[PDB]
């Protein structure tokens, strides 16, 4: 009655004592937007298995023998052989299937949970929030009683067949889906997202194009994608609670998260968020809906009869709660509770603390950071005769977020330390030097490059010694930046570097990018030619002409970070390009009725298109016939119907499909019936792999 | 990898600092498709 307890369902009475409580939170409800919600989370994961969590690409991740460095968040895990994780893949499909079904619906969960931590836990390179939100979800729906209608183990089981529900179900996902706004939407709440820097690139898509008949470019990449995104995420929290807003926040909603999906690759986040906006609706919306159907419709769609009593419920007349609505109410409080605190509990894991906080995907800080990467050198010192040299950037490795996290540097110097000697390399000292830029800043070093790695100290609960800070100071410089950058030609490019006192850089310009300059932004640096050794001291707004193909040195002798700025051009590609539009103008020459002499014997080819019965084209000719097919074959691809992409996207999409069902099977047989000979094992891998035409 | 060429570099080709250009907009929260 109260209007208190209309808006928020219940009353303050209700919270005066502990049992109260409980009988709130066990209260009966209907079950029936539960088990859809059930039936598509249950279908997305059985998609999302065979395309995201890598059960295709399984065969070249975890295949035996080779060499690999692997990130796992702790150091005894290791992975199985590669049948027995096709084998946890199967497992994993079954559970889901089991999910969507409600067939032993306990059984499936436990089935999938366990399978999906283990291969989440395996690698810490494969962490993003929607695999998160899947996992969490998962473990939340263990103990949800969500095959209570519409569920095949209602068939098989009276009891549990159109029966009531505690509230506390819907309480926890809905307090799951509302954090996740919420605090997406405060984390949101920075610098580099409400100044238009973060995703500055993203309001060019079309989609996007009717926003501009009343904007300007400048204005729609902040007030409508930035300013928009941190509204809709903190009103998308609040809106769909309320009675009053619901249908447009519906509304909104749908559409943020339908734009997302189209921009994005993320995969089948968008649609799992689309089937959890429904749940703050009414919990009988399903049956009214099956109601409003012709009966020919209601003999095959569930029940529309009215829910029977339960066990798992607490009916008020007393009835004494039990043990089970108990521990349903700690649950759910105790795990809201932690899901509040663990986005915010980076001040106690410091180890992964970064320019960034902690390992992502725990954090619901989702398009927040970019960063580009210029360089990265690893060096190693021999133990046994002192020669130093250089490793490949990315050897024995497979994903590239090791250069943004000192813990994955100090697991990849560990296993780099192993292999090496299997190269005659005795007990190295291995020393890295990264640079990377965060939303467009200057390019600084992540970590100090004076310092073994190997023999370094790393403990999870304090603080990394060499992790040097971003140097926040340099921030408005980014105005001035850009418009460096268009002062340039078409040709001209640019690179601003950012360096802390003491260090030094080493650079080789290569032969072919002639006329290189470098000229300094602030602080005082000191460049050195090694040819000559000859060394000067630069001064503010001063400029010189570096070496092409040699060895050069820049210095920080300065008290502060010194900032500088390299601006080269390539010679080779404009010589060869002017050779290209010469070329091509003695063509068209010829072609228009011009040039009425004998065109010269390295020019035939151009016009015949085939290089037989001749000598070798020059490599002149070559590229420039190259450069001919891939323009037609861009034009070409531009111009293609929407209905052959389609089909092609079909046709890939069925091409994964096939390939993971047959490599799984013929794991399943080599693990159960042996191992046949090596000729049939080709044979059927062959079989495998090809196309579906 | 193996074979002693894809494991070292010399010392000129592994301190190129410069490259020219005819991912840069990494977010950490795309999927990255292989086969
Ligand atoms: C001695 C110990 C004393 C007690 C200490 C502990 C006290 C804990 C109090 C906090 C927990 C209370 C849980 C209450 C459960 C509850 O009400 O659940 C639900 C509410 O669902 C939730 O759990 C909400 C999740 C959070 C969503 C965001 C809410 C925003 C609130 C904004 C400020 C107001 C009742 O829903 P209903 O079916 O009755 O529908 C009501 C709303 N309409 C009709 C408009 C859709
Ligand atoms: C109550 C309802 C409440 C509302 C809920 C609304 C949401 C429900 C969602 C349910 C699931 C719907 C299907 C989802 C499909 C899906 O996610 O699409 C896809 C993934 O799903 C698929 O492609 C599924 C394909 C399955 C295979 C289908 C094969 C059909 C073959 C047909 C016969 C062909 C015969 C040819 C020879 C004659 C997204 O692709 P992607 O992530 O790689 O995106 C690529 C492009 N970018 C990156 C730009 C985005
Ligand atoms: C890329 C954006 C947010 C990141 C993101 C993603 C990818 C998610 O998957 C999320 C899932 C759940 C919760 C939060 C998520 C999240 O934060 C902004 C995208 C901006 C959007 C495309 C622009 C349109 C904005 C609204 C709908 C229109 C308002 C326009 C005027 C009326 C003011
Ligand atoms: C190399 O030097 C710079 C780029 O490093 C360019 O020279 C520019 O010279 C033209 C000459 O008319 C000026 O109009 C531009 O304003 C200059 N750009 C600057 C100062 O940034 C050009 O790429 C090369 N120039 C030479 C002489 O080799
Ligand atoms: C050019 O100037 C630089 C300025 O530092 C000189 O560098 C230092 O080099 C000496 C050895 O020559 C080292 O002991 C110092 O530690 C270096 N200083 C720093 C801050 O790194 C360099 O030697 C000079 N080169 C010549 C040929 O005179
Ligand atoms: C400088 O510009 C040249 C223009 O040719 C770039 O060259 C191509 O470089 C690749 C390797 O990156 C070679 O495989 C090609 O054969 C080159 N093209 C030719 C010869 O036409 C070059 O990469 C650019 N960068 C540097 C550092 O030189
Ligand atoms: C040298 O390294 C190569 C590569 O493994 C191989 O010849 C052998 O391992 C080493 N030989 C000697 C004599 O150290």
């Known amino acids: 009655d109260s209007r208190i307890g209309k808006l928020l369902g219940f009353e303050w009475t209700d919270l005066s004592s502990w049992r109260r409580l409980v009988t709130l939170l ?128 209602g068939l098989l089981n009276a009891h549990r067949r159109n029966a009531h529900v505690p509230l506390w179900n819907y309480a926890v996902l809905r307090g799951q889906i509302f954090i996740v706004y919420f605090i997406a939407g405060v984390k949101k709440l920075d610098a580099d997202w409400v100044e238009g820097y973060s995703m500055e690139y993203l309001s060019r898509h079309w989609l996007f194009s009717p926003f501009k008949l009343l904007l300007s ?19 998308a929290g609040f809106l769909l609670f309320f009675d009053v807003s619901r249908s447009i926040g519906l509304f909104f909603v749908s559409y943020f998260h339908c734009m997302n999906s189209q921009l994005f690759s993320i995969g089948m986040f968008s649609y799992v968020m689309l089937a959890s906006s429904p749940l703050f609706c009414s919990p009988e919306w399903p049956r009214k809906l099956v109601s409003y159907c012709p009966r020919r419709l209601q003999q095959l769609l569930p029940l529309k009869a009215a829910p029977q009593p339960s066990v798992s419920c607490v009916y008020k007349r007393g009835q004494k709660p039990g043990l089970r609505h108990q521990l349903g109410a700690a649950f759910t409080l105790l795990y809201l509770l932690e899901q509040l605190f663990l ?133 408005p410089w980014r105005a001035k930046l850009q418009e460096i950058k268009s002062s340039l030609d078409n040709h001209t490019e640019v690179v601003f570097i950012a360096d802390f006192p003491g260090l030094h850089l080493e650079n080789f310009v290569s032969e072919d990018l002639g006329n290189t300059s470098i000229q300094l932004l602030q602080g005082e640096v000191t460049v050195e030619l090694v040819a000559e050794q000859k060394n000067q001291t630069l001064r503010e707004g001063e400029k010189m002409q570096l070496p092409a193909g040699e060895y050069h040195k820049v210095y920080t002798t300065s008290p502060s970070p010194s900032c500088y700025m390299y601006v080269y051009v390539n010679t080779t590609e404009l010589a060869l390009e002017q050779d290209l539009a010469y070329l091509q ?63 092609r996207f079909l046709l890939r999409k069925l091409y994964v499909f096939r390939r993971s069902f047959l490599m799984t099977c013929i794991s399943l047989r080599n693990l159960i019936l042996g191992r046949p000979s090596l000729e049939q094992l080709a044979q059927e891998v062959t079989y495998a792999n090809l196309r579906p035409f | 990898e193996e074979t002693d060429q894809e494991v070292f570099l010399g010392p000129p080709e592994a301190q190129s600092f410069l490259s020219s250009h005819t991912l840069t907009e990494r977010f950490w929260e795309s999927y990255i498709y292989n086969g």
Not at chain 1, 114 to 125: A, E, I, N, Q
Not at chain 1, 596 to 621: A, M, R
């Open chain 1, 585 to 647: 103008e003695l063509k068209e020459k010829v072609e228009n009725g011009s040039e009425t002499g004998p065109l010269p014997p390295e020019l035939q080819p151009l016009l015949e298109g085939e290089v037989k019965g001749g000598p070798e084209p020059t490599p002149l000719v070559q590229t420039f016939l190259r450069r001919q097919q891939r323009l037609q074959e861009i034009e070409r691809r531009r111009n293609t119907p929407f209905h052959e992409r389609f089909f």
């Open chain 1, 26 to 153: 066990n209260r009966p409800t209907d079950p029936a937007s539960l088990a859809v919600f059930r039936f598509l989370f249950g279908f997305l994961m059985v998609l999302d298995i065979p395309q995201e969590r890598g059960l295709s690409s399984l065969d070249r991740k975890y295949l035996d023998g080779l060499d690999v460095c692997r990130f796992p968040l702790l150091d005894a895990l290791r992975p199985l052989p590669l049948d027995w994780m096709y084998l946890v893949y199967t497992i994993m499909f079954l559970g889901a299937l089991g999910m969507m079904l409600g067939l032993c619906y306990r059984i499936s969960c436990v089935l999938f949970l366990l399978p999906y931590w283990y291969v989440f836990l395996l690698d810490k390179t494969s962490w993003n929030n929607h695999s998160y939100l899947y996992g969490l979800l998962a473990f939340q729906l263990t103990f949800m009683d969500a095959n209570h209608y519409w569920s095949v183990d």
């Open chain 1, 343 to 475: 986005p915010y509990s980076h001040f106690l894991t410091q180890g992964y603390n970064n320019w960034t906080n902690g390992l992502y995907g725990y954090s619901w800080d989702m398009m927040v950071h970019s960063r580009s990467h210029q360089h990265v050198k690893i060096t190693y010192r021999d133990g046994r005769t002192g020669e130093l040299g250089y490793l490949n950037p990315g050897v024995f490795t497979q994903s590239r977020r090791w250069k943004d996290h000192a813990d994955m540097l100090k697991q990849y110097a560990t296993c780099l330390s192993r292999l090496l000697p299997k190269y005659n390399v005795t007990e190295p000292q291995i020393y890295f030097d990264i640079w990377v830029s965060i939303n467009d800043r200057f390019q600084q070093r992540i970590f100090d490059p004076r310092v073994d790695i190997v023999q370094a100290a790393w403990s999870p609960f304090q603080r990394t010694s060499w992790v040097q800070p971003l140097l926040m100071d340099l921030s």
């Open chain 1, 217 to 235: 470019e400048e204005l729609t990449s902040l007030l409508v994608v930035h300013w928009g995104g941190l509204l809709l995420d903190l009103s």
